[PDB]
Amino acid sequence: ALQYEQTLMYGRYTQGEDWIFLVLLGLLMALVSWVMDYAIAACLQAQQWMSRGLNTSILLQYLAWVTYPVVLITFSAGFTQILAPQAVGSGIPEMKTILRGVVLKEYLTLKTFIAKVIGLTCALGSGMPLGKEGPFVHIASMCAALLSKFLSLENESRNTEMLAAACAVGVGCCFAAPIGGVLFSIEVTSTFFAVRNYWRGFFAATFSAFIFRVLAVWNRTITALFKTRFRLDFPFDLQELPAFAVIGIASGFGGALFVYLNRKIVQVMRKQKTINRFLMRKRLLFPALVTLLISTLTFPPGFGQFMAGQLSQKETLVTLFDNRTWVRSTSQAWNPPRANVFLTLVIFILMKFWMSALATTIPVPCGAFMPVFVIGAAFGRLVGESMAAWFPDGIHTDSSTYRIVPGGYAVVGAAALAGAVTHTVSTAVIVFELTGQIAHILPVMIAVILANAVAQSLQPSLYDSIIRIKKLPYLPELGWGRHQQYRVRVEDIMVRDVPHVALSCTFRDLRLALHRTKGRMLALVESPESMILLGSIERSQVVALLGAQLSPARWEEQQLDEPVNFSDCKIDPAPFQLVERTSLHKTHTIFSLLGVDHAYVTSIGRLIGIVTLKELRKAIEG
Amino acid sequence: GEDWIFLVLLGLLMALVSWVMDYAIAACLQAQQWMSRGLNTSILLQYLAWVTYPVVLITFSAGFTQILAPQAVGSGIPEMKTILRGVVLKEYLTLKTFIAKVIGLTCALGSGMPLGKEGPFVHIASMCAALLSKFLSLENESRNTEMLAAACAVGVGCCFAAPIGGVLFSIEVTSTFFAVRNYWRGFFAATFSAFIFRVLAVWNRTITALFKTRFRLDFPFDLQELPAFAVIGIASGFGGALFVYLNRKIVQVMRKQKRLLFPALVTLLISTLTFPPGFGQFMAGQLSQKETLVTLFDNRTWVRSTSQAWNPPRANVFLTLVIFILMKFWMSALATTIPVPCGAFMPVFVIGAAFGRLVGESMAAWFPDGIHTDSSTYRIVPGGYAVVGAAALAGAVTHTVSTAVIVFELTGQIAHILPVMIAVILANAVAQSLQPSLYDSIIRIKKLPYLPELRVRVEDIMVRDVPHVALSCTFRDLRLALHRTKGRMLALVESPESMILLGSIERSQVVALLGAQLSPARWEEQQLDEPVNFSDCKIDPAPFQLVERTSLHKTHTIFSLLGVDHAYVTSIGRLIGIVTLKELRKAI
């Protein structure tokens, strides 16, 4: 059991019925998502009304423009800190750790639910570049846990499956994409998923989508969030494929750079102890300063006109996916009177990159999927506009028909950058669900594959990076194509010094052994000379043996050093063990599936070594 | 960079093979129509050609498959699912099997019989991967299984021209775990195959989607039309369960009751009923499978060209659709059991499309001016109903939910996603409640090893025979040990008294050295009988074992993960038992 400790940016962790349950989970998640969306829309509408009311002087417009988001972010951070400090940030890495066996202290309580809901609503009510997929996963998991609490009024296996279904429900409700949501949730929270549990997520997401449609028709887009209208007859040509490949490669490099920049930002001010202490005594100055800095640069009368600061995230995504060519309201916002579309796109890309990283490193419930999606869409739109300008009449034409469509480039770029950042290939399906069309399928697959290859060659995923930052249990993923590990054996990476005890030992031996292990379990051995393994023992239990046979109720303590009879103790008969010539592939696979953190190496029945997650991490990294 | 090169070469080879096979099938189908229509004006000659062409093709396919490689008969998905679980089939991935499968599939699909390609394509892709792996060596067991899984994904994708849907379908029918890296490798190889197919479709010339639809993008369906899309799913689930039951019952009956007569009789019976000017006008027998699927997916309303085959002068669309559904159902159920390389995905797809079209036309006739009246500009689109029904029936038969993605890549549109998902979920629920999957039924028919599904520990289910050899054993015990047992591999122990496990030795190696030592040398065969020298063998030093007190659930989970079929039970380093899928006799 791990407990949250508060830090500046992220924190640290220190030491029959199925159908009804799925239907109820889907309905609850749909209702909660609808309520949150309504609240966020109301907040944005209030911001627009207040901004339109005060059109007198630039000073007052600036004051309102920088006062609304700062107040919203400060209130969100304060409310989250008062109720549940552990509800800060994305919830995908924490649930990935939970699904592997580890237990977090109070991660699935009602207070955390209230804090997460209110904080996400308040933080997303401002205009900061933040997402909601991780918070949605966490909220869905808490909803499933509370439903299990209610419906109760073997067990361990059931809970994990329900949480796995809840993650898919959360992703699907976040993107309004059942299939894409389930496939994305499978890739980011597990490595070996049972085929039997494949239908549960699809069923729950389908029920959620049906409830969404019913609510949409009872409340008055309906089909797709960001519906696009592209021609079905030759949307692209053959010679445009190199452009899509270039987009994919650049997106992979950019995703690696984004993950590296986020990690570097987090690390830098974990140093600088004086600034860190001064901010830790404030607890509300850092988010306020970040919000004030970001909002100032997006002021439309000032610097915000050169990066489309007047547009919101939904409006920014809608204009990039349109079926018009800007080069030859989308063009009005993306073509300021003093510049062209290219300069605006470049400035938008750079500023949004660094601002999105910095904003995702602040203490509020937030995600990082939509910002990178928008950045990738902008980069793809830039590439498409360049191609359209270079070929005004087409790339293969007789009567100048079938011109270049720059919106497919934006779709391809968004999917490629999202996949590169998250190390997933389901962003293709996600973007097909989001846009409502499947015409630009092959370029999307090509770009996603290339971006994933480059990103996995360069840097780890964002969620794995956050896991490393928070010091949670971390099993690095084996190289997809970077290297080979079919020749490395367990005899090399193991540690040849094993904390162990003997069957015929004395209490002095236990006293000497206990302090130097620094581990959870002790290995029972027949005899020191034979070194034959018989089982595993608990460190607390062998402490209790000394505490029980060496006690006031009987100095005398130094008189009693007889050999310890292990009959009273309880021994694990079959701990997890391996053999001498086991390959790294099998060890990694069993560690990944069983969710274990410790294995014994055995040679002809004798104890020769031990393997831990740390040794595996060094073996993979080196 | 061996992985990327292997995947690229696999994709290229599979794309080329699929293109060649499609060209051959199209040539055969055109040659049928040429002789059918060009030079015949009499009823008797037309009938004679109509029956004699498919009969000759099917008889040649069956004879060629039997003579060359009998293992090429049937689908390839159940056998590859068995192979990926650690079982070994005798000669399932050789060159003769490849040639027999290719020629038999080309000849069988050249006729007008209702057969598919997904299983044969999976088998051919796996064979291509095995041959490529053999050629590239100019041998880790763990590396080969991953490549076979990638080959299955490539085969499905090339069959349906649906890369993502093909990968998802292949993972769901030939595996028990969703491995993410397998998904990534299949994605990569299917993307390369799709690129090659796109290049070929431009160099030669149904580009993009195979059965592209042109439904309107603004309000294709209403909320009140959803109950129909659920009725379709429930009916499709029931129909899929009935289809699996009927196929199994057809297979069983022939067992209770000269090998070139049954396929010929089946072909002559089926082709007689589909003869157009006789009974073929009442079930649209003049259309091929591609044209049958094309007309059922159009954006026109019949009840308000090539779609006039469903409206004969002496009948209407409803009667023709019902007759087509019934006759094609029983004909496909019968025809999928003849000794030729064949699949069953497409006939089920067409039957589901016909049922969906029937339901959609009924709804369109019920609401001539559109649902919710008001004389609105949005009316019923019966093509989407056909898509929904086809996807639902295919998913119900195959116990899969990736048929939705498959149909989305097939039609080129994703406008009907919610009804398709609802129908697929309902059909899967009903079918899984009623009957097992078609591939599982075939596995149980062929009596292949399989793992069931999931107090008791590995000490109880184990068997203590465990054929083995000792390090100090002579050639007399090696002959004695080999004769009694029949297993693929043998265990190596230190001594009969010690019984300390040292690894495992293959059956091929021991019989080779026994023959080599007792080979003619410079009576003397029995004279030497010296203790064997194991220093020149191929000893596996790390077989995967199980501790004595391991639980059944832990044993079950490791067996599914590792793709193995037998484990060694060990006490303190001593061999005490073996577990070779004895969970089938204990987890049932």
mmCIF file of C-alpha atoms in Angstrom, chain A residues 19 178-179 183 186-187 190-196 198-199 202-203 206 209-210 213-214 217 222-223 227-230 232-238 241 423-426 428-429 432-433 436-439 441-442 444-446 448-449 452-453 456 477-482 485-486 489 526 532-534 573-577 579-583 585-586 589-590 593-594 604-606, chain B residues 1 3-4 7 140 142-143 146 163-164 168 171-173 175-181 183-185 187-188 190-191 194-195 198-199 202 205 207-208 212-215 217-223 226 401-402 404-405 408-409 412-415 417-418 421-422 425 428-429 432-433 453-454 457 494 500-502 541-545 547-550 554 557-558 561-562 571-573:
data_model
loop_
_atom_site.group_PDB
_atom_site.id
_atom_site.type_symbol
_atom_site.label_atom_id
_atom_site.label_comp_id
_atom_site.label_asym_id
_atom_site.label_seq_id
_atom_site.Cartn_x
_atom_site.Cartn_y
_atom_site.Cartn_z
ATOM 1 C CA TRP A 19 -24.920 -7.151 -17.908
ATOM 2 C CA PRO A 178 -16.719 3.257 -28.572
ATOM 3 C CA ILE A 179 -14.349 1.156 -30.682
ATOM 4 C CA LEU A 183 -8.767 -0.027 -28.324
ATOM 5 C CA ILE A 186 -6.390 -1.561 -23.950
ATOM 6 C CA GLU A 187 -3.018 -0.267 -25.168
ATOM 7 C CA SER A 190 -2.182 -3.266 -20.044
ATOM 8 C CA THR A 191 0.092 -5.450 -22.154
ATOM 9 C CA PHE A 192 -1.771 -8.799 -22.162
ATOM 10 C CA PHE A 193 -5.567 -8.568 -22.372
ATOM 11 C CA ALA A 194 -7.807 -11.629 -22.286
ATOM 12 C CA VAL A 195 -9.904 -12.135 -25.414
ATOM 13 C CA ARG A 196 -12.820 -13.213 -23.201
ATOM 14 C CA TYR A 198 -13.061 -8.083 -25.119
ATOM 15 C CA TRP A 199 -16.852 -7.703 -25.426
ATOM 16 C CA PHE A 202 -17.640 -2.602 -26.377
ATOM 17 C CA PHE A 203 -21.028 -3.350 -24.805
ATOM 18 C CA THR A 206 -22.234 1.140 -27.026
ATOM 19 C CA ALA A 209 -23.220 6.079 -27.026
ATOM 20 C CA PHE A 210 -26.924 5.202 -27.162
ATOM 21 C CA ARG A 213 -27.744 10.009 -28.674
ATOM 22 C CA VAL A 214 -30.935 9.978 -26.584
ATOM 23 C CA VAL A 217 -32.093 14.393 -29.285
ATOM 24 C CA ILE A 222 -25.241 14.867 -33.235
ATOM 25 C CA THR A 223 -23.184 12.354 -35.239
ATOM 26 C CA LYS A 227 -17.513 16.202 -38.548
ATOM 27 C CA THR A 228 -15.670 16.795 -41.826
ATOM 28 C CA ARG A 229 -16.999 17.002 -45.394
ATOM 29 C CA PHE A 230 -14.465 15.666 -47.909
ATOM 30 C CA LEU A 232 -15.319 10.579 -51.692
ATOM 31 C CA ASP A 233 -13.962 10.486 -55.271
ATOM 32 C CA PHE A 234 -10.148 10.553 -55.253
ATOM 33 C CA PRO A 235 -9.581 12.554 -52.038
ATOM 34 C CA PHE A 236 -5.804 12.190 -52.493
ATOM 35 C CA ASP A 237 -3.309 10.945 -55.088
ATOM 36 C CA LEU A 238 -0.348 8.566 -55.114
ATOM 37 C CA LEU A 241 2.082 9.722 -49.935
ATOM 38 C CA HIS A 423 2.720 5.347 -28.190
ATOM 39 C CA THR A 424 -0.602 4.059 -29.532
ATOM 40 C CA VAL A 425 -1.899 3.037 -32.956
ATOM 41 C CA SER A 426 -5.602 3.349 -32.072
ATOM 42 C CA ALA A 428 -6.332 6.167 -36.360
ATOM 43 C CA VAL A 429 -9.649 4.640 -35.288
ATOM 44 C CA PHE A 432 -12.045 8.115 -37.922
ATOM 45 C CA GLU A 433 -14.744 8.191 -35.238
ATOM 46 C CA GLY A 436 -17.012 10.752 -39.262
ATOM 47 C CA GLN A 437 -15.184 9.757 -42.460
ATOM 48 C CA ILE A 438 -12.791 6.930 -43.298
ATOM 49 C CA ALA A 439 -11.559 8.130 -46.691
ATOM 50 C CA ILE A 441 -7.247 5.772 -44.011
ATOM 51 C CA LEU A 442 -3.988 4.650 -45.657
ATOM 52 C CA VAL A 444 -3.233 7.949 -41.488
ATOM 53 C CA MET A 445 -1.931 4.408 -40.969
ATOM 54 C CA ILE A 446 1.377 5.234 -42.668
ATOM 55 C CA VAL A 448 0.917 6.662 -37.349
ATOM 56 C CA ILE A 449 3.256 3.722 -37.990
ATOM 57 C CA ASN A 452 5.287 5.291 -33.479
ATOM 58 C CA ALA A 453 8.519 3.783 -34.810
ATOM 59 C CA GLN A 456 9.596 4.398 -29.549
ATOM 60 C CA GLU A 477 8.625 -2.064 -22.460
ATOM 61 C CA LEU A 478 10.772 -4.350 -24.589
ATOM 62 C CA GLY A 479 12.179 -2.913 -27.799
ATOM 63 C CA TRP A 480 9.780 -3.274 -30.713
ATOM 64 C CA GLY A 481 12.575 -2.966 -33.274
ATOM 65 C CA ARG A 482 15.439 -1.156 -31.559
ATOM 66 C CA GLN A 485 17.004 -9.735 -26.473
ATOM 67 C CA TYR A 486 16.496 -13.387 -27.443
ATOM 68 C CA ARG A 489 19.638 -15.047 -20.144
ATOM 69 C CA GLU A 526 17.268 -26.584 3.637
ATOM 70 C CA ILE A 532 18.178 -26.105 -1.617
ATOM 71 C CA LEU A 533 15.155 -23.808 -1.782
ATOM 72 C CA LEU A 534 12.038 -24.875 0.114
ATOM 73 C CA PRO A 573 5.353 -23.780 -0.664
ATOM 74 C CA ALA A 574 5.488 -22.567 -4.285
ATOM 75 C CA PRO A 575 6.938 -19.073 -4.709
ATOM 76 C CA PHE A 576 7.556 -17.808 -8.219
ATOM 77 C CA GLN A 577 10.776 -19.368 -9.521
ATOM 78 C CA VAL A 579 15.636 -21.680 -14.078
ATOM 79 C CA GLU A 580 19.221 -20.949 -15.074
ATOM 80 C CA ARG A 581 18.947 -20.590 -18.863
ATOM 81 C CA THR A 582 15.651 -18.690 -19.042
ATOM 82 C CA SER A 583 15.706 -16.012 -21.726
ATOM 83 C CA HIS A 585 11.923 -12.551 -23.369
ATOM 84 C CA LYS A 586 10.138 -15.135 -21.217
ATOM 85 C CA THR A 589 6.559 -11.639 -20.577
ATOM 86 C CA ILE A 590 5.764 -13.420 -17.304
ATOM 87 C CA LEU A 593 1.374 -10.631 -17.350
ATOM 88 C CA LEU A 594 1.532 -12.007 -13.793
ATOM 89 C CA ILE A 604 19.320 -27.912 -10.168
ATOM 90 C CA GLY A 605 17.105 -27.055 -7.204
ATOM 91 C CA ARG A 606 19.664 -24.768 -5.537
ATOM 92 C CA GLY B 1 16.671 -4.652 -38.376
ATOM 93 C CA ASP B 3 12.054 -7.693 -37.856
ATOM 94 C CA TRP B 4 11.209 -4.806 -40.184
ATOM 95 C CA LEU B 7 7.496 -7.847 -42.068
ATOM 96 C CA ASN B 140 14.114 -19.572 -31.713
ATOM 97 C CA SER B 142 9.457 -17.967 -29.549
ATOM 98 C CA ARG B 143 10.284 -15.953 -32.674
ATOM 99 C CA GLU B 146 4.930 -14.257 -33.331
ATOM 100 C CA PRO B 163 -6.062 -3.899 -42.646
ATOM 101 C CA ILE B 164 -7.177 -2.757 -39.180
ATOM 102 C CA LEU B 168 -8.496 -7.231 -35.076
ATOM 103 C CA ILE B 171 -6.366 -11.552 -33.022
ATOM 104 C CA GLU B 172 -9.896 -12.497 -31.940
ATOM 105 C CA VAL B 173 -10.094 -15.921 -33.632
ATOM 106 C CA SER B 175 -5.407 -16.251 -30.008
ATOM 107 C CA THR B 176 -6.408 -16.170 -26.349
ATOM 108 C CA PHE B 177 -4.562 -12.982 -25.319
ATOM 109 C CA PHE B 178 -4.444 -9.463 -26.755
ATOM 110 C CA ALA B 179 -0.698 -8.908 -27.064
ATOM 111 C CA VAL B 180 0.029 -5.275 -27.892
ATOM 112 C CA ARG B 181 3.248 -5.968 -29.810
ATOM 113 C CA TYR B 183 -1.114 -5.826 -32.704
ATOM 114 C CA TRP B 184 1.666 -3.409 -33.688
ATOM 115 C CA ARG B 185 3.412 -5.936 -35.952
ATOM 116 C CA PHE B 187 -0.610 -3.145 -38.111
ATOM 117 C CA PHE B 188 2.781 -2.559 -39.752
ATOM 118 C CA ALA B 190 -1.063 -4.835 -43.068
ATOM 119 C CA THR B 191 -0.193 -1.198 -43.787
ATOM 120 C CA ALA B 194 -2.432 -2.027 -48.273
ATOM 121 C CA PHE B 195 0.185 0.265 -49.819
ATOM 122 C CA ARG B 198 -3.052 0.597 -53.774
ATOM 123 C CA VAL B 199 0.000 0.763 -56.050
ATOM 124 C CA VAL B 202 -3.298 2.149 -60.079
ATOM 125 C CA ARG B 205 -6.562 -0.151 -63.731
ATOM 126 C CA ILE B 207 -10.357 1.033 -56.088
ATOM 127 C CA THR B 208 -10.382 2.058 -52.404
ATOM 128 C CA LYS B 212 -18.179 1.309 -51.773
ATOM 129 C CA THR B 213 -21.491 2.875 -50.735
ATOM 130 C CA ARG B 214 -22.752 6.412 -51.378
ATOM 131 C CA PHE B 215 -25.238 7.008 -48.571
ATOM 132 C CA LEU B 217 -24.080 12.077 -44.798
ATOM 133 C CA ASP B 218 -26.885 14.213 -43.296
ATOM 134 C CA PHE B 219 -29.234 12.221 -41.047
ATOM 135 C CA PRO B 220 -28.949 8.748 -42.635
ATOM 136 C CA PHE B 221 -31.204 7.310 -39.916
ATOM 137 C CA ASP B 222 -33.547 8.474 -37.163
ATOM 138 C CA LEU B 223 -33.701 7.617 -33.476
ATOM 139 C CA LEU B 226 -33.240 1.914 -33.710
ATOM 140 C CA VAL B 401 -17.090 -7.858 -32.802
ATOM 141 C CA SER B 402 -14.467 -6.717 -35.332
ATOM 142 C CA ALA B 404 -18.140 -3.817 -37.577
ATOM 143 C CA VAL B 405 -14.690 -2.443 -38.413
ATOM 144 C CA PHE B 408 -16.601 -0.031 -42.251
ATOM 145 C CA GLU B 409 -13.436 -0.636 -44.277
ATOM 146 C CA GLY B 412 -15.821 3.024 -47.220
ATOM 147 C CA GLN B 413 -18.274 4.808 -44.908
ATOM 148 C CA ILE B 414 -18.731 4.961 -41.139
ATOM 149 C CA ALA B 415 -22.078 6.770 -41.060
ATOM 150 C CA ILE B 417 -21.689 2.972 -36.763
ATOM 151 C CA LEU B 418 -24.168 3.029 -33.864
ATOM 152 C CA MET B 421 -22.514 -1.769 -33.040
ATOM 153 C CA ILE B 422 -25.915 -2.380 -31.430
ATOM 154 C CA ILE B 425 -23.480 -6.724 -29.686
ATOM 155 C CA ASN B 428 -22.951 -11.853 -30.297
ATOM 156 C CA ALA B 429 -24.838 -12.081 -27.001
ATOM 157 C CA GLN B 432 -22.729 -17.027 -27.479
ATOM 158 C CA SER B 433 -25.731 -17.837 -25.294
ATOM 159 C CA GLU B 453 -11.966 -22.237 -20.228
ATOM 160 C CA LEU B 454 -11.504 -20.674 -16.766
ATOM 161 C CA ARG B 457 -3.152 -28.181 -7.514
ATOM 162 C CA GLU B 494 20.921 -37.208 -14.309
ATOM 163 C CA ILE B 500 17.405 -34.814 -11.330
ATOM 164 C CA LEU B 501 15.982 -32.940 -14.316
ATOM 165 C CA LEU B 502 18.696 -31.673 -16.674
ATOM 166 C CA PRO B 541 18.793 -26.557 -20.936
ATOM 167 C CA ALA B 542 15.732 -24.509 -19.887
ATOM 168 C CA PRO B 543 12.379 -26.174 -20.456
ATOM 169 C CA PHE B 544 9.633 -24.437 -18.514
ATOM 170 C CA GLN B 545 8.617 -26.375 -15.407
ATOM 171 C CA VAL B 547 6.791 -26.258 -8.814
ATOM 172 C CA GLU B 548 5.065 -29.122 -7.017
ATOM 173 C CA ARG B 549 2.470 -27.035 -5.154
ATOM 174 C CA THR B 550 1.366 -24.727 -7.985
ATOM 175 C CA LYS B 554 -1.592 -20.350 -12.136
ATOM 176 C CA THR B 557 -2.671 -18.763 -16.977
ATOM 177 C CA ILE B 558 0.914 -19.738 -17.836
ATOM 178 C CA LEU B 561 0.388 -17.053 -22.178
ATOM 179 C CA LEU B 562 3.396 -19.076 -23.314
ATOM 180 C CA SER B 571 9.583 -31.197 -6.472
ATOM 181 C CA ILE B 572 13.048 -30.068 -5.313
ATOM 182 C CA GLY B 573 14.760 -30.533 -8.655
#
